[PDB]
């Protein structure tokens, strides 16, 4: 199984630092979390192709123009539970992708996953900070917890909205992913759709019981994604 | 540089699962976070001595007696920002220590760290979930952000109390640590002291700018720690 992995990095102190994952949906578009972007910082995207969990070839490093960052207009970092934690990043040039990997598909607008749906997260378990990409990738099964279950009082209660997906919160943790990292799920036909970008976790961190990682439901923002991509 | 690393684990579905780190402060006492403990669960601690991030020899697995988990009386999981997130775990037998890494020392009661003090976190980055202890330890410098700076409105504001220690919040990520894991600082004498046990992180996770990881300040609870150990 081949994938393209994303690291979004910002410059400080004459070096770039990993801040979020993201999902390469087009050779020059990345979907990530809005919380990942301040348009004041200088950004670059580092890409790396993985066969299974093994890095193949060389990383590609692509600078980003301020204004090629498209944060959702309703995103407000002072209110994570208000949702809308989603952003598009247009690469300043197209990544060179070859043709090993079928890029993750945008899910059908309004698509809601069934309770216990098998989805997966991949990433560097937030241990990658900058520099040469890790030669290995972490991947894990995070079954979804539908709104009805996720909003139980002892789970996320009234904190979650229906524009969010919860996944995990039991024995398996979501610590293998990254901030802004994608939640991928297998379509009927068998493709992979990005169903979520990682938004938030409990105050106690990833892997806390009954507090699944909460993802921005990408299927609730299709309109804005299309309209944004088509305009730029 | 030596250190005894602690994995506190709870039994679920017939196996043990890592839930928190902690610090071995005596041959049969571990300090950790109160949020790590549910008195209804069955626990064991797995200990490993690491030198320069590599496991020395083999792990030790020590069961915890029912009733040998002591949570601070003021710990309320409904109020993380209230503080008091601290607990002691008595080991059913003493760890086998050899004579390489001396134990983590408790700080003097009331001891406050300077702003920017070079402290360290070590752990498995929440990637270790159970089974044989990882051969390698993650360690990172995580400088202290004193209460004056951490309580800034744009940092943690009113959420942090004087009974907590902040560390990080800039380019240096706190993602290498574990829930309940120690913040270890060098003392004037050259010994290492546990000044904190990891309590909470921002909703965005462990590597969030202007949201340093927040530790329970161990030096605020020396009376309770000492009393609990002397009595049990």
Curated annotation (Swiss-Prot), chains A, B:
Pfam families: Trypsin. The keyword Transmembrane does not apply. One of its GO terms (molecular function) is serine-type endopeptidase activity. InterPro entries: Peptidase_S1_Elastase_sf, Peptidase_S1_PA, Peptidase_S1_PA_chymotrypsin, Peptidase_S1A, Trypsin_dom, TRYPSIN_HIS, TRYPSIN_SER. PROSITE patterns: TRYPSIN_DOM, TRYPSIN_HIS, TRYPSIN_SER. Residues 1-230 form the Peptidase S1 domain. The keyword Secreted applies. Disulfide bonds join 20-36, 79-82, 119-185, 150-166, 175-206. GO terms for biological process: digestion; proteolysis. Pancreas. Keywords: Digestion, Disulfide bond, Secreted, Serine protease homolog. It is found in: Secreted, Extracellular space. GO terms for cellular component: extracellular space. SMART domains: Tryp_SPc. Monomer. The zymogen is secreted as a ternary complex composed of procarboxypeptidase A, chymotrypsinogen C and proproteinase E. May protect procarboxypeptidase A against denaturation in the acidic environment of the ruminant duodenum. Belongs to the peptidase S1 family. This is Proproteinase E. It comes from Bos taurus (Bovine).
